[PDB]
Design a protein around this ligand. Structure first.
Ligand code: HEM
Ligand SMILES: [Zn+2]
Length: 153
């Protein structure tokens, strides 16, 4: 669980993400595919994007990042009572896209990195701790849904 103080820290930095969802999403994917190349392998349709400018100019990639961050945003605002939002996400990521939990970890590191790049004076130690705690809870809870659907994280 997270304290109410921790959730407020989570939602305060998320309101800043919300000022440019598209740009954060772009930055997170660029970080994630470079840091963990196997990650680009799963998002097949972006495999021809060989350059950062290419990635930034693709509206496909951009709308993709908005869709993902939108879902995560709706989840965080539930402050842990997110089973209703996690099931559909577990279903597609567990059975259709086949995304290991370790890739979720990779994505979380990307997110924390971009939050720090874009919002340093609003993403100090305690906001960092809280967001990590929020994303760790999401990863736990979606791992458990994954197993419910069969097969492992
Ligand atoms: C905070 C973590 C993420 C969230 C909230 C999330 C959310 C979403 C949502 C809402 C969709 C569209 C509907 C769907 O198929 O469920 C989607 C699509 C998809 N996601 Fe995720 N995603 C996450 C992480 C990942 C990771 C880490 C990757 C692969 C390394 C990934 C791969 C995909 C792919 C391949 C699709 C289909 C995209 C297509 O080609 O149109 N997702 N995701
Ligand atoms: Zn993605």
């Amino acid at each position: 669980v997270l304290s109410e103080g921790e959730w407020q820290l989570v939602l305060h930095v998320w309101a800043k993400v919300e000022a440019d969802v598209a740009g954060h999403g772009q930055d997170i994917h660029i970080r994630l595919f470079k840091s963990h190349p196997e990650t680009l392998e799963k998002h097949d349709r972006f495999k021809h994007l060989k350059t950062e400018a290419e990635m930034k100019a693709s509206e496909d990639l951009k709308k993709h990042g908005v869709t993902e961050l939108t879902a995560l945003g709706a989840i965080l605002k539930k402050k842990g009572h997110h089973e209703a939002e996690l099931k559909p996400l577990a279903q597609s990521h567990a059975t259709k896209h086949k995304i290991p939990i370790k890739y979720l970890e990779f994505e979380s590191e990307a997110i924390i990195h971009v939050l720090h790049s874009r919002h340093p004076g609003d993403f100090g130690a305690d906001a960092q701790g809280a967001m990590n705690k929020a994303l760790e809870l999401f990863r736990k809870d979606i791992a458990a849904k994954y197993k419910e659907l069969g097969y492992q994280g």
